[PDB]
Amino acid sequence: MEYTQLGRIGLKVSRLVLGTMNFGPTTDEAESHAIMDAALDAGINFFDTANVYGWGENKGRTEEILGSWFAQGGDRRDKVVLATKVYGNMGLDGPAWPNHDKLSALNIRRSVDASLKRLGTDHIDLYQFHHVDRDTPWDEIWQAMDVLVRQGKILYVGSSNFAGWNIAQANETAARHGRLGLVSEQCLYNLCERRAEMEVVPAAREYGLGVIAWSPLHGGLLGGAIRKEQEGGNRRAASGRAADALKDPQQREQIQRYEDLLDKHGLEPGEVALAWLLTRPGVTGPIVGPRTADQLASAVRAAELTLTDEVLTALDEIFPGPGPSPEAFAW
Amino acid sequence: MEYTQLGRIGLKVSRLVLGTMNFGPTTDEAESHAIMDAALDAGINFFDTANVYGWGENKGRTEEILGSWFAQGGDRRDKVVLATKVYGNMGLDGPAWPNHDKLSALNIRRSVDASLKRLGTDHIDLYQFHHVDRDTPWDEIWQAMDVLVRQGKILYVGSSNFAGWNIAQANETAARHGRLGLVSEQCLYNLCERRAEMEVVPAAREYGLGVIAWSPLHGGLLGGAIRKEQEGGNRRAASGRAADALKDPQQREQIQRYEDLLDKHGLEPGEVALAWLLTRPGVTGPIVGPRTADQLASAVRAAELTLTDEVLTALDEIFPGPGPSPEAFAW
Amino acid sequence: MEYTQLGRIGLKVSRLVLGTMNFGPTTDEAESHAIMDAALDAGINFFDTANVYGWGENKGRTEEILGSWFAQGGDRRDKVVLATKVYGNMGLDGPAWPNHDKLSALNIRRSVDASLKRLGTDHIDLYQFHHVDRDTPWDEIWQAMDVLVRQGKILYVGSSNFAGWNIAQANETAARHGRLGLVSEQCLYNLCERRAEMEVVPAAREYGLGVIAWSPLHGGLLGGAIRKEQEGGNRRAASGRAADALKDPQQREQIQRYEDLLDKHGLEPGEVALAWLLTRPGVTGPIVGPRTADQLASAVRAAELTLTDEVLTALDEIFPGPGPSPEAFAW
Amino acid sequence: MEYTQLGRIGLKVSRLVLGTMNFGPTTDEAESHAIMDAALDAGINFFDTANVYGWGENKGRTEEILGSWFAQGGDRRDKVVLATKVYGNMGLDGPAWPNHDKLSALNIRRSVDASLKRLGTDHIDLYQFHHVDRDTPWDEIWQAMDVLVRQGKILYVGSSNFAGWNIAQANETAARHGRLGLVSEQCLYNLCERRAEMEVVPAAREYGLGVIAWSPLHGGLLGGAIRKEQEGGNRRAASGRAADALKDPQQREQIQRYEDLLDKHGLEPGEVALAWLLTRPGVTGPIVGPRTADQLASAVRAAELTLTDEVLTALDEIFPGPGPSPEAFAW
Amino acid sequence: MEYTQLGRIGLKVSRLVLGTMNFGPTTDEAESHAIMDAALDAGINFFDTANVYGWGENKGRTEEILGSWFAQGGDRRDKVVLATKVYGNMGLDGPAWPNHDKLSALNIRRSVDASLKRLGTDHIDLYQFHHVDRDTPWDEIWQAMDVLVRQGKILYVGSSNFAGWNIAQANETAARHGRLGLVSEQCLYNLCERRAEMEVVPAAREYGLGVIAWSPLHGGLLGGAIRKEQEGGNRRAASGRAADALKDPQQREQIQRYEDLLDKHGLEPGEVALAWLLTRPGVTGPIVGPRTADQLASAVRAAELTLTDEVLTALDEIFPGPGPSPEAFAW
Ligand SMILES: NC(=O)c1ccc[n+]([C@@H]2O[C@H](COP(=O)([O-])OP(=O)(O)OC[C@H]3O[C@@H](n4cnc5c(N)ncnc54)[C@H](OP(=O)(O)O)[C@@H]3O)[C@@H](O)[C@H]2O)c1
Ligand SMILES: NC(=O)c1ccc[n+]([C@@H]2O[C@H](COP(=O)([O-])OP(=O)(O)OC[C@H]3O[C@@H](n4cnc5c(N)ncnc54)[C@H](OP(=O)(O)O)[C@@H]3O)[C@@H](O)[C@H]2O)c1
Ligand SMILES: NC(=O)c1ccc[n+]([C@@H]2O[C@H](COP(=O)([O-])OP(=O)(O)OC[C@H]3O[C@@H](n4cnc5c(N)ncnc54)[C@H](OP(=O)(O)O)[C@@H]3O)[C@@H](O)[C@H]2O)c1
Ligand SMILES: NC(=O)c1ccc[n+]([C@@H]2O[C@H](COP(=O)([O-])OP(=O)(O)OC[C@H]3O[C@@H](n4cnc5c(N)ncnc54)[C@H](OP(=O)(O)O)[C@@H]3O)[C@@H](O)[C@H]2O)c1
Ligand SMILES: NC(=O)c1ccc[n+]([C@@H]2O[C@H](COP(=O)([O-])OP(=O)(O)OC[C@H]3O[C@@H](n4cnc5c(N)ncnc54)[C@H](OP(=O)(O)O)[C@@H]3O)[C@@H](O)[C@H]2O)c1
């Protein structure tokens, strides 16, 4: 396993981050536990989850599944850098009761306690804002996070779905009063969606945040979804983001040229998409979303893959990116 | 003439900013002087220029044309908020001698003295960085600008062609030591190019910066370029940014839709493109680029236009924007 | 003559401040100079003026009258604490040209140089904001005033017509970065108008500001205006603030009881109104507004007067005050 | 017993520091307890240990031996300034699992709780970084240590095996936000290795850190290891740093001239090496590493020794040092 | 010519720095002027000098030689980053009159004015402390430098012959109050003397200082001095640092190994020693000290040299370095 520092901080993480969103609604508990043990066996020490994972009536299920995994012993908790999230409504889906979503100090207090209980642990290593909350100012947010740091309930704070200027404002505010700022940003970044290159990744690099890419396969769309389109099973690529893209002709053409490109070179689409993120400057790693143990082993092979300059140049022509602002739209 | 504060600061400006880029390479000194006289007569108090305007061997020409205008007296200098720019290479076009472009304290010192000399004035009201310089840190930049403030050579500092996160870093750094930060950002923003909406204008709004939109007509492309395409004269729409667009079938189709829409509503294309910027949240105003006194009078009418909701919705249809990050590309 | 520190600072001032607003529009130059000579002879070392004094086409005349008085030599400038003001429109009466009124760094730059030219002096001791400007933030204002301090063009900064919370925000902002804040507030305070007791004077006292009361006779209303009502001449009491009040039966009765009370006690109404202000806690002193040299001598006698508890109690009955907020309107 | 302040802080310490590295792997529990009772009887109030001491499969053993010593009662814990360390891998020897070594907030949290449990105490008086960790920034480190300070788990923070500029950076960062910085540096310093004089000790003295010298006899080499080379026993000088130095004829000769010089002066080599350290400016004292009660008594005699200038000169000729940078290598 | 940023700041400099110490005592004025024109022609934009250069009764002569060079016109001053130095005694050689050497605010004021006059310029781009002054505190030094920055007499401040911890203390102190810190350290660093690697270069790199190496050929010792040993000319290698080294058998043996090695590879000793420094991480460049225009051309060739791994390995065996502290002397 390749390791790296999480941005500027002293925390060392595997360059594959184990995502757990499938655990519960797509992968059942026993298989979820098998994936996590396999992940630890391959040297992955960085697990991402969220309080909302499980979905609908089953929100919190994923954190519970991790909690029973930890309760097996064997230094599982001690070996894992455990990350979860606050922002989402944990009540009935639909409009939330006021302050039962977003980032008020009130919702931060109640959300972290509920996550700690479900996870069966006295601390979260990386507590992440699931999304920017424009209505909560940074002196309120850092007040609340600092309470948790001092109480030993969290170690580090991270962001997710921030704009680049939110990262700058957050960490400048933290720095003025001696607080450790955001240590990482979890943003949507993959071959199909590269606009985090404009400002999110540049701001993260300047401020020394790790960068971890969620939906690195665009929800399975980059996993060989065309070749597999008629297959059954409970596959994520049959729904949501991937199925939406495949209905659209120009995006379908993109994935078709992508799967054709990799047929020529004899490479696997899921593995190449992960390996491609590992080449992008500033990227700590993809957050892999295995549904099965074989998909985890596939991600592990993806981390050992070297893409040639030919393949990298060809991917760039199929999936151009904007580069940074202001050059991306001005000069 | 409608006035507004420039973002959060005490300076009041006309919502039309007079751009001077045409003065010299496209508009001669005599017509330039008349345009500026008409600008003052119409209540426009805010002029934008740059050291490099003039182009090629005539870099600095524009500042000199403004200087001979001020030298005529009549309270012209006292009435005008004078903005200019540093970053550009003022030597022979091509690779600059080291530190003769960009934002080192060395180049700021020599550039500001050259501009004051050409402009024939002892102070610049708004001194702007022409572009982000990723290699100069903000404590060096704010040191150099603070020397100029305390010497009385400049009043305010502004940015141009920044990323949103550069605005945040700049003003947070300035605030740690009680310096007035950036007061305005001058960015490309018009019907044709709306990606400043993702992060640049959001960051400017959070930090209380004015937002002044350069090339509000995309270089004359939105001024009725199709209807005018076969005309003679020294037209900006006949070259550069506008000519390249009218070559691409889809960008041309976009502009054809625009010109056809406005013919059904009795509106002029250049006036609508300016009036549209004036409706955008956080926009101080467009930096108009008249080539003729007639075109300046047209802009003054544009500032009095009220666009109906039907025209605004139709324009959104032809010229969609991305809105803010992270929603623009994630959720 | 009684001297006191101006609030918390080391400057020592006479408890009578010489107001000059009459000098020009009401008192001619010759007698203006006479009043100033007699003021200095009585030990008054603190003169208040403004760039706009003179009024209409003659704005700046008062400063020019002071200029020619200092020009006579005699250690006059060295012996006087010279205070003037920035904010007002120095152009034609009516809507001002943008940034030719208010408190932008731009208007501060141009106003102080024109005041120094008219006064014939290289520095102003106390440079006062004529009025709060809600559109200019304090980091911009303190930037501009710091330039003046460091250039030696001013010594101290004071306010006029501020709200109490403006005084707090201004001096907290200055203190943050090691600037000396406002040293004095010049507010309307007299027997007829006591609402400065609510917040302005409490905030001034908390922050250690001098308090100097403008129109201490309410524009002559408290100077015997009813007794003198039928006399001709260009008396201030005939017009403006005093005229309006006397046309109101409720306020006219107040003044009638006032003048009758002091007739019974053998006291002069002008002198009593000044002595009253000198008893108020936090008040440095009144800014007297003599129209004649006799009225100046009267002010000097007011500063030697001791008002009995009986007279003070009776004045309180005729001219009740609100006291401080929140008690003034809540509990 | 001579006492001194630990650098600039209020803590008073014996100029002999009791090192505990031998307790467990070299000296058994009952003899270790005997030495610690004798240390206290001698007035030594300052004990140094580490989580890793005990070595190999027995890491943590030394802390347990001190824990059983404290558990005897008798005001032993109340009388002792207890120092331990964080940084070392406490797992199986080899490369550590990520974040189970070094100075991340994660490893600091897990290491201190493990040490407190082994030591059987609720607080550590001096918690030391065992080595600089170049990948962890000082705002992460000080956040972590400040959590422990505010929870009462530690009192002071110290460093060990730092460069001089690490000390400066650490304490400047601490001071910015009012944290007490490093109070001591534990560095390798003895007659054989004097390069801490170049920058480590000068930086410590500038920032007012104590300087406590580890391996003061260079692992037993300066304790008469030539004369005793044929001796048997679990001797430290028979292995490690000392045995290496004697395999090398070039420094073997240095030890020979040293043992010869002290033969002539009737002095004990172990005692002289400690007494020499007590003469060095800025040195709090040496960390003695007795294997036996008798070597502790010998160290106590060493602290009462007076080395004549004759001997100091001769020692400085056998064992020259570089003095401070930049003079040590430039001018 | 290769260019690089000077550490973290926006200043771009040639990776060859032209040293001027030879100009005067070794190279006469005419050929000094020729070398400087040749340097500019080659694209070298960064000149180093000092007030004392000239030596003895001719101290200041080197600055005058640069002054007459600038006075020729030709954009010479505008194109050059001009560095000079303060600390040295400018009076009669011997013990200095108090405050006529070292870094008191008093000596800094008088030294900079003398240097500006001799240089014939109104500003120094990079004003450097010639040596650490342990007796002057950093708030005194930064006050003096800030006076010069705000007066426009200097732009940047640099250090020379500092210890690593001095760099840290200097820049932390500067940053506390918004001052730009040291931008560069000028230290002795070459194949013969590598102890700047222990702590000076690491501190410089951490704090983002440029590193410019003085006497990069060890005063000519590395320029072929054994092969040239019996030659005439006013050769720097015939005296001083290089001559004393060739006296010592161990040191002479090292240079012999060097020259013999390069004969086997068809490389020149002066050029290799320069090219070697350009490979060292964190080194901005060597400060070349040509005696002739031919030696300047040879340095320019050295900047285009690529040293093979074989040669770099062989040089490291001849000229081992200590690497960073604490590992250099501890672990
Ligand atoms: N911060 C946020 O807003 C956010 C949002 C979403 C996710 N996340 C995090 O990012 C993690 C991953 O997101 P994701 O599940 O959407 O990632 P993804 O990799 O885009 O999608 C997962 C799907 O890709 C396929 N796949 C996975 N590994 C593969 C492989 N080695 N080869 C071929 N196909 C493979 C599987 O598709 P099939 O099922 O069709 O076989 C799998 O269910 C989540 O677990 C969560 O921790 C964060
Ligand atoms: N900060 C930067 O990087 C940057 C870059 C560019 C410009 N600027 C600034 O922004 C200012 C404006 O830039 P620009 O000149 O490109 O503006 P623009 O308005 O996009 O282009 C100017 C052209 O639009 C046409 N036009 C202007 N006013 C019109 C009207 N009322 N009705 C119809 N057509 C009209 C004319 O084209 P025809 O000649 O074809 O008639 C005119 O020459 C410049 O003067 C400069 O100050 C800044
Ligand atoms: N900061 C602001 O916004 C502001 C506003 C107004 C004034 N000020 C300052 O405050 C100063 C005083 O204002 P003001 O002129 O309105 O003062 P005032 O004392 O309220 O009114 C002046 C008039 O009162 C009469 N008077 C003056 N002294 C007298 C005395 N000893 N006995 C009897 N009557 C006397 C005269 O009225 P008759 O002519 O009827 O005899 C005189 O013209 C001004 O000079 C100016 O410096 C500041
Ligand atoms: N921070 C770090 O990196 C680090 C590293 C090492 C140590 N330390 C600390 O520094 C302490 C001392 O280290 P150390 O054990 O290596 O010290 P040391 O004094 O250099 O070596 C100990 C050995 O010196 C001999 N000795 C001790 N006292 C003597 C005396 N009075 N007369 C003659 N010989 C004597 C004994 O050797 P024989 O057994 O051969 O008789 C003893 O085992 C440790 O206990 C530990 O607390 C810290
Ligand atoms: N901050 C300080 O304390 C300090 C101290 C000293 C110097 N400096 C600065 O560092 C600069 C350089 O120092 P330095 O003069 O001692 O440099 P140096 O390069 O170590 O010594 C100069 C000598 O090396 C020889 N040489 C130079 N270039 C050569 C080449 N391309 N090929 C072969 N030989 C070459 C010449 O020796 P021969 O004459 O024998 O031919 C020349 O006189 C000085 O000018 C000064 O700016 C600073």
Residue numbers in the entry:
A (entry chain A), B (entry chain H), C (entry chain B), D (entry chain C), E (entry chain D): 1 to 331
List sentences from the manuscript.
Aldo-keto reductases (AKRs) are a superfamily of oxidoreductases capable of reducing carbonyl to primary and secondary alcohols, found in all phyla. In this work, we identify the enzyme AKRtyl, which is responsible for tylosin reduction. Phylogenetic analysis indicates that AKRtyl is the founding member of subfamily D within family 12 in the AKR superfamily. Specifically, by combining steady-state and transient kinetics, X-ray crystallography and molecular dynamics simulation, we demonstrate that AKRtyl exhibits a positive synergy mediated by an unusual Monod-Wyman-Changeux (MWC) paradigm of allosteric regulation at low concentrations of the cofactor NADPH, but an inhibitory effect at high concentrations is observed.
Further, we added 1.2-times NADPH during AKRtyl crystallization, and the structure shows that the octamer exhibits an all-liganded active state (R4-N4R4-N4). Combined with other liganded states (R4-N2T4, R4-N4T4, R4-N1 R4-N1 as shown in Supplementary Fig. 13c–e), we find that the structure of the tetramers always exhibit symmetrical features. (2) The tetramer has structural symmetry in different ligand states (unliganded, partially liganded, fully liganded).
